[PDB]
Amino acid sequence: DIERPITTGVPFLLVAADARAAGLGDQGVATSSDVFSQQWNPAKYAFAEDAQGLSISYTPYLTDLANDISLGQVTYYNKINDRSAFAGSFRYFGFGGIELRQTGDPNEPTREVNPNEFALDGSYSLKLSETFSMAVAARYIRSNLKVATEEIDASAAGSFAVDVAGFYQSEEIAYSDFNGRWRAGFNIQNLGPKISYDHDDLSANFLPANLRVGGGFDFIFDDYNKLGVSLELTKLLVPTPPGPGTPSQSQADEANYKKYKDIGWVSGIFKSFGDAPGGFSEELKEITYSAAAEYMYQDAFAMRLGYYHESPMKGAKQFFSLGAGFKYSMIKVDVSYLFSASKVKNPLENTLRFSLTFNFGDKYETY
């Protein structure tokens, strides 16, 4: 099964937080610009068709077991000119309120704790050419999942990260049977100093620095029918920990872990690449991929199929995804569902993700 997974701090940053991208196999770096294009590619916020947008996304966890354990997302975007846009997103994972109770006269006042984990980011995107755009984002991450007891300190752990994204969208190009469109995107994510959960520099965790590279094509038929096919590749920019042994039995493992944990995040970004005696094929096992197809009718109905494949050596997240989207007047509703194909139980199995966006303001034409 999973041999040597990459250990990163705040892994909740890697979870898809909107139903549209979830229904497309957890990919958004090269899909069409939308209100959720902050976790995936902020650079396409400059390609938005509506001036302003707001969005609320709900991803429940352990639906059969309990309520209120969920990852929510609130996104807002405002493109001021036809070339630039500002965006701000907030992701919040929570277990809900938990009451701390001893029997102790059960009418007694009780303390409610809400262990949570949130990220708040703001991005600026600017169109360089008519077909290309770039974006820079700044994110603050806070983790408060611990509950204060005796001999347990529940101080929150915080960190900062930066995001560099690029998005290319071509104009409509006529072909023999259809007039499609081309899209490409890259996104370097979560570049920042290590997060210390125990507030000690010796015990710090890498931020989940990530690289997404994707490309997509739009088959446009009849001016009312669209088929967007997108492919995304993802690589974690965190060094892989040592495994069984990389030449005193436990001494070698201890020394290897000591040298691995004493690696800077900046240097770790480059150490993620290579670090193997083999070639590109041996390094291909650290690349996750996803393929998505989205059929769109009258820009008002959307039907999404997706496939996400991690290498079973790390993570073991392999699944198919179903998605649907509707647009009434200015309100868009997305629903997504997951069919797992992995041996390890997916925490988002048998779960319906919900998304709801409001679009308002001026309308921009698409080049």
Partner: peptide
Amino acid sequence: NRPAMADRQKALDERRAAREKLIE
């Protein structure tokens, strides 16, 4: 009382020209 590809390309060219002229 007063060759679909070529048509699609002509429509795209007309749309581009109209969108360029309208804003300026």
